[PDB]
Each structure stands twice: as structure tokens, then as C-alpha cells.
Design a protein around this ligand. Structure first.
Ligand SMILES: C[S@@+](CC[C@H](N)C(=O)[O-])C[C@H]1O[C@@H](n2cnc3c(N)ncnc32)[C@H](O)[C@@H]1O
Length: 328
């Protein structure tokens, strides 16, 4: 599905806006060095310019959305990114030899600093064929991105990978197809290695059968895991139109669906999908803003742009959640 694939352009636009303004990198929360903080910005800037070489249409969409980004949206992107990263980093620090599987990775570049930071990390990026082909093109065309992953300019990887370069793999898969998915995982991961699974704005685009089988199958496949999921929720308090409005706005405007947004309309309902894991934690992103962001960071962000409407930020961010499920 082209339309589902193109939701990544929004995610990338948001990432680039946050970096351009300076919300990210957050060197404390993302545990970046002086050099990697610089590279973080450089890598993303290069991605954008390289995207332009490969697609006028995609660049246009990203470019226009990124320059029109509002502060409330930038705070969202910041919270989403440092929330996920904080969870990843705690686990990688504790477990030196680990494998990360990023499900529906789109244009995500968090592997670039992570692979440098953690010598025994192995990382697998998975998305639809058309999406990974574009990412592969970009990563190999840009000199600084090539250097960051040790890539040849040429496509030297053999099916089933587009990149198969040591501790990093990029592979096409339709994650609605569990047989394809398990066959892929069988040749790029091992059962016994501690595993982080990432689903950042992936599961919201799936029907419940597909998302549940994906969760159940992948938790069954690895002995020792942490699943970090980020997604919107419809909202549970009465007279909360957020979910209804979002679904209507997405169908009307873009012919896009979020099939379980109203089903899993609270953080509790959402987290229940991982109830086979013994250790499940869920917070909305306002809770993250108030309890996990240090005061030093709130002050920094206040220096970048005016957030004139803090309540509006709250109303939005209570509709995004970060779920951490751990099993062994
Ligand atoms: C909103 S984007 C998020 C991308 C990235 N995780 C991020 O947060 O920046 C959703 C991504 O999930 C991918 N996706 C959705 N359904 C998929 C499926 N059935 N198989 C593989 N990828 C899928 C899309 O192609 C897209 O790149």
C-alpha cells in the first residue's frame, strides 16, 4: 500500500523539523558524544538532500511539511524520539550483545549512532519493498551515510537483503504476512540473543488480527526481549472526539485507516495486547514530558521556540503512548 508507505514522509518531515530547530539531538537523553551529536544532524541533513536526488515528489512533501512545522508538533517529535531512545539505551547498556529489530522502520536513522555506540549491537531494519529500496538507494548514494554503515556504492547484497553489512541489515517484508516475517527473522536473528523490538507508528496501520499475530509470534520467538511500541490512542474520557476526528481526517484527506485506534483507546487497553509478557509498562507522552524529561531539557526547549499553548500540547500528547513490554 503506497498510502501507508507514505506516512513515513510525515515522520521524516517531523524528524527533520525537530533537528533543524534544535530539539534533537538531545545529547543527554540520547547519550550522544560531541562527535555523534554533530553526525546525528549531518546524517539527517544528508538524507534529505539525497532524498531530493531520488524523488522530486517525496522531497516536495517532506520539504513543505518540515518548514511549516509548529512547536507543538516539534515537542511531540522530541518526546517520541527521546522516549523510545531512553528505553533502548537502558537495555543496550545492560545487555552488551543485543539484536534490534525495527518493524516498519521507514526513514529512521537511529541505528547510525547506536551501531557506533554499541560494538556488539546487531540491527535489522524492516519495511515494505518499495520503502526499503528507497532507503537503500539513499544510504548508498550519500558519502557520509555510506561511511556510517561501511557500505559500497553498489548494491552488493543478495536476497533477501538490500543491505547485509555486518551488524546492520535492511530487508523487505510485508509484516501483515507472518510466514514471510518469520522466514526473514530466521535468517537475520537468533532466538537466544537479547532482543529489542521497535514498532514506532507501525501497528496503528494494521488490523488487529495482523498486529496481534505479529506480537504473539515475535514474543514467542525470542527468549529474552523488550518491545518498545509507540502509537496514538483514540482517547477514553467522555466527549473526547480525538479518535473519531483523526479517523475521519485520515479517510477523507488521504484514504488512510487506523483500524484499532478506537479499539485501543486507552493506554491500558493498548498495553493489554502484550499481556503474555510479565513486565508491561505504559505511559502517555505528557506523563513522559513531566516525569522523564529533566528540568534542564524543558528549559533548553523553551529557548528554541515559543510554545504558547501548553494545554494544547497536553491534549495532543495524552493521545500518544509509549509501551515497554519485557519477557524472558
Ligand atoms: C508512520 S511511518 C513510521 C516510520 C518509522 N518507524 C518512524 O517512526 O519514523 C509507518 C511505517 O510503517 C511501514 N509499514 C506499515 N505497514 C507495514 C507492513 N505491513 N509491512 C512493512 N512495513 C509496514 C510503512 O511503510 C511506513 O514506513
Amino acid at each position: 500500500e503506497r498510502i501507508i508507505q507514505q506516512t513515513d514522509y510525515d515522520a521524516l518531515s517531523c524528524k527533520l523539523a525537530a533537528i533543524s530547530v534544535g530539539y534533537l539531538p538531545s545529547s543527554g537523553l540520547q547519550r550522544l558524544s560531541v562527535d555523534l551529536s554533530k553526525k546525528y544532524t549531518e546524517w539527517h541533513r544528508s538524507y534529505l538532500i539525497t532524498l531530493k536526488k531520488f524523488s522530486r515528489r517525496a522531497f516536495g512533501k517532506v520539504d513543505k511539511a518540515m518548514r511549516s512545522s509548529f512547536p507543538v508538533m516539534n515537542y511531540g517529535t522530541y518526546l517520541r524520539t527521546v522516549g523510545i531512545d531512553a528505553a533502548i539505551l537502558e537495555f543496550l547498556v545492560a545487555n552488551e550483545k543485543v539484536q534490534v529489530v525495527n518493524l516498519g522502520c521507514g526513514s529512521d536513522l537511529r541505528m547510525l549512532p547506536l551501531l557506533q555506540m554499541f560494538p556488539h549491537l546487531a540491527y535489522v531494519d524492516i519495511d515494505y519493498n518499495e520503502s526499503v529500496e528507497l532507503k537503500n538507494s539513499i544510504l548508498r548514494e550519500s558519502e557520509i551515510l555510506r561511511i556510517s554503515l561501511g557500505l559500497s556504492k553498489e548494491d552488493t547484497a543478495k536476497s533477501p537483503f538490500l543491505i547485509d553489512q555486518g551488524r546492520y541489515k535492511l530487508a523487505a517484508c510485508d509484516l501483515n504476512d507472518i510466514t514471510e516475517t518469520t522466514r526473514l527473522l530466521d535468517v537475520c536473528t537468533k532466538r537466544e540473543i537479547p532482543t529489542i523490538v521497535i514498532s514506532e507508528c507501525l501497528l496503528c496501520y494494521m488490523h488487529n488480527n495482523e498486529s496481534q499475530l505479529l506480537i504473539n509470534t515475535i514474543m514467542s520467538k525470542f527468549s529474552h526481549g523488550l518491545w518498545i511500541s509507540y502509537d496514538p490512542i483514540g482517547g477514553s474520557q467522555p466527549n473526547d472526539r480525538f479518535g473519531a476526528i483523526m479517523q475521519s481526517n485520515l479517510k477523507e484527506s488521504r484514504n488512510l485507516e487506523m483500524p484499532t485506534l478506537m479499539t485501543y483507546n486507552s493506554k491500558e487497553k493498548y498495553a493489554s495486547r502484550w499481556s503474555a509478557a510479565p513486565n508491561v509498562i505504559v505511559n502517555d507522552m505528557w506523563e513522559i514530558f513531566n516525569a522523564q524529561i529533566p528540568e534542564s531539557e524543558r528549559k533548553r526547549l523553551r529557548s528554541l521556540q515559543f510554545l504558547d499553548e501548553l494545554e494544547e500540547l497536553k491534549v495532543m500528547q495524552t493521545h500518544y503512548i509509549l509501551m515497554k513490554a519485557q519477557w524472558h
